[PDB]
């Protein structure tokens, strides 16, 4: 009281746990793009003929 919603602590640790989420999403986003890129490489290799 006080009694507010920051929410509450604890900086360091707060960031530690926050950072744990979303990374895997970025990974699958990167992999998705790379998969498309490889696909285009294959498509080009086929169109080569």
């Amino acid at each position: 009281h006080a009694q507010t919603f920051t929410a509450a602590v604890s900086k360091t640790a707060w960031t530690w746990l926050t950072s744990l989420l979303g990374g895997s999403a970025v990974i699958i986003i990167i992999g998705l793009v790379l998969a498309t890129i490889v696909a285009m490489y294959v498509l080009t290799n086929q169109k080569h003929n």
Binding site: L21, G22, S24, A25, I27, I28, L32, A35, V42
Partner: protein, 52 residues
């Protein structure tokens, strides 16, 4: 549970990407009429050491 569920979905998506990646590799590998793709494997090296 929410964060774990999101990570779980990411893992599943990654696996799906891997399977599609294996298809992408195998596509040019079809056979091919020749049974010889040393150099396709040498460059791409997708995995599954093939073979002798």
């Amino acid at each position: 549970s929410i964060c774990a569920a999101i990570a779980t979905v990411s893992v599943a998506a990654s696996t799906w990407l891997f399977c599609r990646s294996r298809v992408a590799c195998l596509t040019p590998y079809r056979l091919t009429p020749n049974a010889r793709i040393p150099f396709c494997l040498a460059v791409l090296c997708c995995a599954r050491t093939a073979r002798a």
